[PDB]
Amino acid sequence: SFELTQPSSVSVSPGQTANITCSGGYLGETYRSWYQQKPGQSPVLVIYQSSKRPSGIPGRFSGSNSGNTATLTISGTQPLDEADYFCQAWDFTSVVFGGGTKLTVLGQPKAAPSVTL
Amino acid sequence: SFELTQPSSVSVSPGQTANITCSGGYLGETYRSWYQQKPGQSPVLVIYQSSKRPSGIPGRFSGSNSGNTATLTISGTQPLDEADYFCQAWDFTSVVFGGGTKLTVLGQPKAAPSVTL
Amino acid sequence: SFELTQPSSVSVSPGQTANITCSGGYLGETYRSWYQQKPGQSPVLVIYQSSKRPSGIPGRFSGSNSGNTATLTISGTQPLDEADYFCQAWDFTSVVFGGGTKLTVLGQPKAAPSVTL
Amino acid sequence: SFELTQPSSVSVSPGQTANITCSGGYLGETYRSWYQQKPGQSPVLVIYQSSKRPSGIPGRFSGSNSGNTATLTISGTQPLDEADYFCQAWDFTSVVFGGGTKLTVLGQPKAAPSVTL
Amino acid sequence: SFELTQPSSVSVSPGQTANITCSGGYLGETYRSWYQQKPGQSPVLVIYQSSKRPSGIPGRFSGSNSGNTATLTISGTQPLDEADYFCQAWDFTSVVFGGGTKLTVLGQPKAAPSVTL
Numbered sequence: 001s002f003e004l005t006q007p008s009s010v011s012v013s014p015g016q017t018a019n020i021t022c023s024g025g026y027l028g029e030t031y032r033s034w035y036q037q038k039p040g041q042s043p044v045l046v047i048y049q050s051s052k053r054p055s056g057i058p059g060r061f062s063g064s065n066s067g068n069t070a071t072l073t074i075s076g077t078q079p080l081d082e083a084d085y086f087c088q089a090w091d092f093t094s095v096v097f098g099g100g101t102k103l104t105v106l107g108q109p110k111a112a113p114s115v116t117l
Numbered sequence: 118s119f120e121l122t123q124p125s126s127v128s129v130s131p132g133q134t135a136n137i138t139c140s141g142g143y144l145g146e147t148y149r150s151w152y153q154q155k156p157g158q159s160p161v162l163v164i165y166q167s168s169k170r171p172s173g174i175p176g177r178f179s180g181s182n183s184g185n186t187a188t189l190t191i192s193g194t195q196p197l198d199e200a201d202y203f204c205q206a207w208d209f210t211s212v213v214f215g216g217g218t219k220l221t222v223l224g225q226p227k228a229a230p231s232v233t234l
Numbered sequence: 235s236f237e238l239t240q241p242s243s244v245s246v247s248p249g250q251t252a253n254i255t256c257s258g259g260y261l262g263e264t265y266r267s268w269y270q271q272k273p274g275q276s277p278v279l280v281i282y283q284s285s286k287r288p289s290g291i292p293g294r295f296s297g298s299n300s301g302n303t304a305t306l307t308i309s310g311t312q313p314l315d316e317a318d319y320f321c322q323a324w325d326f327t328s329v330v331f332g333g334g335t336k337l338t339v340l341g342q343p344k345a346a347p348s349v350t351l
Numbered sequence: 352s353f354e355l356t357q358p359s360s361v362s363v364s365p366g367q368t369a370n371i372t373c374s375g376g377y378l379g380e381t382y383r384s385w386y387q388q389k390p391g392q393s394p395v396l397v398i399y400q401s402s403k404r405p406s407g408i409p410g411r412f413s414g415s416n417s418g419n420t421a422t423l424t425i426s427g428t429q430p431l432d433e434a435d436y437f438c439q440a441w442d443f444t445s446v447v448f449g450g451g452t453k454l455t456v457l458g459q460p461k462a463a464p465s466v467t468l
Numbered sequence: 469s470f471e472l473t474q475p476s477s478v479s480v481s482p483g484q485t486a487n488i489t490c491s492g493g494y495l496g497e498t499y500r501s502w503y504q505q506k507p508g509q510s511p512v513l514v515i516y517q518s519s520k521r522p523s524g525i526p527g528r529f530s531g532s533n534s535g536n537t538a539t540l541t542i543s544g545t546q547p548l549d550e551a552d553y554f555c556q557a558w559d560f561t562s563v564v565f566g567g568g569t570k571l572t573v574l575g576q577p578k579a580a581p582s583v584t585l
């Protein structure tokens with residue numbers, strides 16, 4: 001009399017857990033007394049872009065970020081007055097597997113009691 | 118008398134869990150006393166783009182971000198006055214598997230008691 | 235009489251845990267008394283970009299960051315007045331496996347009691 | 352009478368744990384008395400970029416950082432007045448396995464009691 | 469009568485634990501009395517970049533640092549007035565295994581009681 005128990009427990013459980021929290025805080029302003037005189041505020045911003053012949057990546061790749069190609073990126077660059085950014089630019093790119101990833105899981109338990117009596 | 122038990126437990130449970138929270142906070146303003154004089158505010162912004170011959174990626178790739186090609190990006194760049202951004206730009210790109218991912222899961226338990234009595 | 239127990243416990247559980255928190259703090263302002271006179275504020279910013287023939291990566295790679303290609307990046311560069319950034323630029327790119335990653339898990343327990351009596 | 356127990360416990364559990372916290376502190380301002388006179392503020396900033404023939408990486412690599420290619424990067428470079436950055440630029444790139452990583456885990460317990468009586 | 473117990477405990481658990489904390493401190497300002505006069509503030513900044521023929525890395529490598537290619541990098545370089553950076557630039561790149569890393573874990577316990585009675 002016998003027992004053959006093969007509780008093969010094949011588990012693949014890849015995954016991230018995250019507690020993300022922003023508190024803009026407390027901005028307490030009491031009796032703010034102000035006298036502001038700014039006549040003739042005249043900013044000038046000239047942006048000029050010219051491209052004779054650009055070209056992109058011809059190969060095979062998988063990387064997830066802006067870097068991939070030739071660009072002009074401007075963000076909050078020249079705020080002139082009273083510009084507040086609270087938890088403003090949160091870029092969370094959680095990638096488990098990038099491009100060109102191959103998963104082959106093989107569980108093949110074998111049980112062959114060849115008993116002769 | 119025998120028992121053959123093969124509770125092969127093949128589990129693939131990939132997935133992200135996230136607690137995302139924004140609190141704009143408390144902006145308490147009491148008796149804000151103001152006298153603002155800004156006559157003749159005259160900003161000038163010139164954006165010019167010219168492209169003789171651009172071209173995109175001819176290869177095979179999978180990366181999920183704006184970077185993939187040649188662009189001009191402007192965002193909140195020149196706010197002139199009283200510009201508030203609270204949890205404004207949250208870009209959350211949670212990718213488990215990118216492009217070109219292949220999954221082949223094979224569970225083939227085998228049980229062959231060849232008993233002779 | 236015998237027992238054959240092979241609780242082969244094949245576990246692959248790759249994943250990050252993170253407690254991320256921002257507190258903008260306390261900015262307590264009492265009786266802020268101000269007299270500001272800034273007539274004729276006139277900034278000038280000239281950005282010029284020209285490209286005769288750029289080209290991208292022809293190889294196979296997987297690295298996730300802006301660095302990948304020839305770019306002009308401007309961010310919050312020239313704030314002129316009263317510019318506040320609280321937890322503003324949080325870039326969290328948690329990558330378990332990059333591009334071109336291959337996983338092959340093989341669990342093949344074998345049990346063969348060849349008993350002769 | 353015998354027992355054959357092979358609790359082969361094959362575990363691969365690679366992963367980082369992080370407690371990340373920012374406290375902007377306390378900026379307590381009482382009776383801040385000010386008289387500011389700044390007539391004729393006139394900054395000038397000239398940025399010029401020209402590229403005859405740049406080229407990208409033709410090899411195979413996986414390194415995640417801005418360094419990867421020839422670029423012009425400007426960030427918070429010339430703030431002119433009252434510019435506050437609190438926990439502003441947090442770049443956390445937690446990579447367990449980079450590009451071109453291969454995992455082959457093989458658990459193959461073998462149990463063969465050949466008993467003759 | 470015998471027992472054969474091989475609790476082969478094959479564990480691979482590589483991972484970092486980190487407690488990262490920022491406290492911006494206390495900036496206590498009482499009766500700050502000021503009289504600021506700065507007429508005619510006129511900074512000039514000229515940035516010029518020209519490249520006849522640059523080229524990138526053709527080999528195979530996995531190194532995560534900005535150093536990887538020929539660039540011009542500017543960061544907070546010339547703040548003119550009242551520029552505060554509190555825990556501003558935190559770059560944490562925690563890499564367990566870089567590019568081109570190969571793991572082959574093999575647990576193959578063998579149990580063969582060849583008993584003759």
Ligand SMILES: *[C@@H]1O[C@H](CO)[C@@H](O)[C@H](O)[C@H]1NC(C)=O
Binds near residue numbers: 017
């Ligand atoms: C963090 O997540 C855990 C669950 O793993 C939860 O018990 C805890 O309260 C969370 N805290 C926050 C601040 O989200």
Ligand SMILES: *[C@@H]1O[C@H](CO)[C@@H](O)[C@H](O)[C@H]1NC(C)=O
Binds near residue numbers: 136
């Ligand atoms: C975080 O998620 C967990 C579930 O895992 C929950 O119990 C907890 O209360 C959540 N907290 C917040 C603040 O979202």
Ligand SMILES: *[C@@H]1O[C@H](CO)[C@@H](O)[C@H](O)[C@H]1NC(C)=O
Binds near residue numbers: 019251253255
């Ligand atoms: C950190 O995460 C753990 C769960 O592992 C939770 O018990 C703890 O309270 C969290 N703390 C914060 C501040 O998020």
Ligand SMILES: *[C@@H]1O[C@H](CO)[C@@H](O)[C@H](O)[C@H]1NC(C)=O
Binds near residue numbers: 253368372
């Ligand atoms: C750190 O994380 C641990 C869980 O590992 C938790 O008990 C502890 O309270 C956390 N502390 C902070 C400040 O997040």
Ligand SMILES: *[C@@H]1O[C@H](CO)[C@@H](O)[C@H](O)[C@H]1NC(C)=O
Binds near residue numbers: 485
């Ligand atoms: C550090 O992390 C440990 C867990 O290993 C936790 O008990 C402790 O309170 C943490 N301290 C801080 C300041 O995060």
